[PDB]
Design a binder for this molecule. Structure first.
Ligand code: NA
Lengths: 285, 285
């Protein structure tokens, strides 16, 4: 039994991400989310997270020796698998011999997944958000376009010029855009990226400056995301982490990206409104 | 002793990189160059390389836990050191306890260097070229500027927008710019970046399209570099590699960036002009 998002096409995706004052706080699993028995960038972890909360998943596509795109964050295999060396030293088939490790170092029986497997699974359940490692931008553009996956596979962009590369190739793409400053807001505008095609990553922490950016972005219809992965996820107790996740929502932030999405869900459950224009986008499978 | 480049100020650096038909073919050590007993991104490898050839060094700055800039390519420690985990997990004091591995996996008694130490050492000897890992652009701009290191520390930029960010901060910066297509040529012009401040990285291989871009760039006074690191450096024998390096220069390329810069030097020494407008920039220490 899983929580799902109900986004049938690009118009639904744009709507989902149009800021509204009655919006539902959103959760995104950093590198898929992780936990005891649940490695980063694993199909199993995505599925586990949806059993507790609706979420999107930010993932790490990178290349094997035979140019297969797999999900795996690091430049070396040791932290989140029982392998050694670079992902790009091994074919996909060879990579299947390794097993993923959870954050405690326990070796699971889960394998490195392909991006294709994740995309096929995500359709009708969630939205994936692609970070950039070593897959060429043109390849990423073509894979999403060829697969008609625009309604459920978003692209992370660090500035307006990268956004424009993608947007000019396919104007139905949706972006997670880095927007940490007033100058960043101007950058996207100068590059002609529609705000309707933007959800904004505003950084790892809230400051008065970042609050001003969030107000600017809300005026433009843009939802804003804090990533707690480097910051509040690292607090020593679940109780301190829970307080921190609630404080982020109380400050007006729309989306929390976290390595601990289930904890985020439990902490903010009491903040989820009963009535919302966004209620229609949520269901269960 | 050592081969040195004799560059006294930013005007000398600009003139060094002004394309001329009688140029001296140049060599750049990718990730600093490497070899048996000589790890990537190591002071010792830079010094060894200069004993055999003049060269520049392309290096990988990244952040420690306490925001010190060190040189280390991978996001995790296992391939080129005896460390485990991420460079950013450790403070500089902790990282100094680890030791570097050469490409065959042999542990040396060499440490992960700071960018500062490298900059200190490079002054009067060579030019360092900074790749982009996780040091933000603002921080890179500051450190070069604060150190008055513009004549000997270049910044790699992937497009005109990145170049513009830097150039607006300090119009004395010199760039290694990615310029792989006619569209990329136009990008730098549209962003107002003077060609006098650009050396061009044109990719890992020569094709007719790339030869056309090299022609265009030569017309604009821009010297062009091929990286052999993913390509010709991987050929199986030193003889095949040497033929490959000569062919690159025969095809009109100005600069070879390589993991094997001493081999490049030995291969192309027979192609170095005996009289050149660029002779003045080379000396010995
Ligand atoms: Na320091």
């Amino acid at each position: 039994g899983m929580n799902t998002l109900q986004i049938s096409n690009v118009d639904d995706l744009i709507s989902f991400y149009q800021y509204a004052d009655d919006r539902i706080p959103l959760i995104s699993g950093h590198r898929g989310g992780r936990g005891k028995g649940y490695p980063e960038n694993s199909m199993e972890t995505f599925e586990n997270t949806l059993s507790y909360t609706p979420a999107t998943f930010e993932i790490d596509p990178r290349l094997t020796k035979d140019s297969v795109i797999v999900l795996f964050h690091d430049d070396t295999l040791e932290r989140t698998s029982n392998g050694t060396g670079k992902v790009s030293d091994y074919t996909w088939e060879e990579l299947q011999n390794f097993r993923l490790k959870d954050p405690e170092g326990n070796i699971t029986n889960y394998r490195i997944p392909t991006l294709e497997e994740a995309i096929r699974w995500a359709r009708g359940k969630t939205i994936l958000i692609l970070d950039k490692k070593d897959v060429p931008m043109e390849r990423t553009a073509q894979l999403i376009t060829d697969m008609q996956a625009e309604p459920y596979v978003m692209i992370t962009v660090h500035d307006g010029a990268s956004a424009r590369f993608f947007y000019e190739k396919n104007p139905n793409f949706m972006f997670e855009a880095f927007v940490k400053t007033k100058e960043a807001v101007q950058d996207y505008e100068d590059n002609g990226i529609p705000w309707s095609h933007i959800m904004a990553y505003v950084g790892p922490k809230i400051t008065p400056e970042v609050r001003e950016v969030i107000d600017m972005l809300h005026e433009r219809g843009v939802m804003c995301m804090i990533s707690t992965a480097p910051s509040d996820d690292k607090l020593s107790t679940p109780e301190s982490r829970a307080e921190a996740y609630r404080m982020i929502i109380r400050q007006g932030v729309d989306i929390i990206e976290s390595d601990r999405p289930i904890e985020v869900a439990e902490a903010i459950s009491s903040l989820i409104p009963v009535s919302s224009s966004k209620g229609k986008f949520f269901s269960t499978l």
